[PDB]
Symmetry: none
Subunit: 360 residues, 2 copies
């Protein structure tokens, strides 16, 4: 009878819609603009007025850090993007792996006390992605605009002790591509120019199967070169930039980070898990998030994990075509399930206990 809302709060993009739908109805930037001199603006409007506004990202590395601006994002999501009255819909919110308890309580408080929701729930993003692939056991690589995680999941639940995190994602890859092209004589600095580079990244970048062979090919021929036309009609051609950019995921030292690459964090996560469930994890590597959209990434992961894993182990990388929205879809499904309707944290329950009722 009543429709649940699903809201996936990302570092770069907010994905929102109605439980049961196959895609989010709303997808907009996680930005809040406030007049340097309406007291606030959200998303594309905030960016269109950037010349007179101070732009802020309320979610950093997947964690909400500015609560006033986050209320404005949720307000815009409910009233403008979805045109619902939040007091009439159970609302499923998503959170990043390793989100502090206090942070989850604050989300719970805002939903109940500011938006007056009748019931709500907070789910881990990576766990939702797994569900969206039809599995309750597996290991997810979730890479977005702000953070990357490996989350091993067993019988529906994440194993927090074996979660690995890499503070490097899409925004950093875009920054790196901006920096490379700029050194080459072009100038990509403004936010307008950042949107151009983001588009170049999404359209022309790919993950090399063998980075070293690819660099050799690029050095000895132009067979890997692609051309991109800028808005002013000017043309820019890239070669090894196409794959050096996402290679950073596997070699964080490319941007001065000492961290392990996504292939190593994947193997390390599995290796922190119970020896008796590793077989199932190796066989169920699910990729999720926009930064896993690079052509070649699955084959490259397959190759890297195979080299680290014992020789007899069956390795399988699942990379669904709708993985830009896997998290949201996982939430739409869960929130639709008959079994799940007893899991909602009700307003009455919140009024009874405190925000600490939310800890699952």
């Amino acid at each position: 009878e009543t429709t649940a809302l699903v809201c996936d709060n990302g570092s770069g993009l907010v994905k929102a819609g109605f439980a049961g739908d196959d895609a989010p109805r709303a997808v907009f930037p996680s930005i809040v603009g406030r007049p340097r001199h309406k007291d606030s603006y959200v998303g594309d409007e905030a960016q269109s007025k950037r010349g007179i506004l101070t732009l802020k990202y309320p979610i950093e590395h997947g964690i909400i850090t500015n609560w006033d601006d986050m209320e404005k994002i949720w307000h815009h999501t409910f009233y403008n993007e979805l045109r619902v009255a939040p007091e009439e819909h159970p609302t499923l919110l998503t959170e990043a792996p390793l989100n502090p308890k206090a942070n989850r309580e604050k989300m719970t408080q805002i939903m109940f006390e500011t938006f007056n929701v009748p019931a709500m729930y907070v789910a881990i993003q990576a766990v939702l992605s797994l569900y969206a692939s039809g599995r309750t056991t597996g290991i997810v690589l979730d890479s977005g605009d702000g953070v990357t995680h490996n989350v091993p999941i067993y019988e529906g639940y994440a194993l927090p002790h074996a979660i690995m995190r890499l503070d490097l994602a899409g925004r950093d890859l875009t920054d790196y591509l901006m920096k490379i092209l700029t050194e080459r004589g072009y100038s990509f600095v403004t936010t307008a120019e950042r949107e151009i580079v983001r588009d170049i990244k999404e359209k022309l970048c790919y993950v090399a199967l063998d980075f070293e062979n690819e660099m050799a090919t690029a050095a000895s021929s132009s067979s890997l070169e692609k051309s991109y036309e800028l808005p002013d009609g000017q043309v820019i051609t890239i070669g090894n930039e196409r794959f050096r950019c996402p290679e950073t995921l596997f070699q964080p030292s490319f941007i001065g980070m000492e961290s392990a690459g996504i292939h190593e964090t994947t193997y390390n996560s599995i290796m922190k898990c119970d020896i008796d469930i590793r077989k199932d994890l190796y066989a169920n590597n699910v990729m999720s998030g926009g930064t896993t959209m690079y052509p070649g990434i699955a084959d490259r992961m397959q190759k890297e994990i195979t080299a680290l894993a014992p020789s007899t182990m069956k390795i399988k990388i699942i990379a669904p075509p709708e993985r830009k929205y896997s998290v949201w879809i996982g939430g739409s499904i869960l929130a639709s399930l008959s079994t799940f309707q007893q899991m909602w944290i009700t307003k009455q329950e919140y009024d009874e206990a405190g925000p600490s009722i939310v800890h699952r």
Copy 2:
């Protein structure tokens, strides 16, 4: 107190000696002979017994590809050419640009585990050549018997993203000269006959300043003709063959290759480098390797880069007279430097970590 060894492993010739000396004491062919029916032979001995041996080149296009035969080359280098005991000398080895990491680890393993060296180091050949010219910033064209590279170098370090490679060098030029003379009625096929053509190439070939004017001169007069006496007393005269041969460096289509010429790869390398350091690269083009020994090559490069580069740019091609051995000399110097003695990878360090300690 202890003398370091320098060993420069080329596709055609091995150059080896002692750090501090002004030239390699040993220079011999990179060949290993194994009896079709001593289990092995190296260099000039292998070639003298070619009629009953299978000859193999363990380094192809500057990259080591046969490790068993390479051990034999190093063994011969240490024990026979230099008459040293490798366990008493730090040893500096050279590698080609874009050498795979795994390849460098295998060299490291052999040096420590098979020859028991006390300490060693692997340096990029082109970078050494630059050092031998008294510079830590510049762009080197390195052309030998098996491969050609452009390596831009800034404050002592190669910029791997802007390295260009041309899979064409001296061996291919010799092959081309063999093929041309053979079509002309002569027969140059055997390895003995290849040595004759190599000698003709080295003695009589040159790079034309203007290829098209030179072809016209050759067509309308005999003023460019030179005569060469074969071992049997027979005389062969060449005209446009003298400069058509090395022209291949600038026009790879002469041997059916779609690749860019050495002038284009030079400009392209500079253009992949930071715009703010190009001025310094244009002003510091160093030539290195035997295939850069052709009379006329510097003036021709000067002319070609000038035509591609912006009109106000100062272009300078440095072609040292000892450039057959620039790489080795650069290594002799580095390995002698007081500053460099802390850079050696020690046996203890190798025993501590793995072969991966070698990545500079």
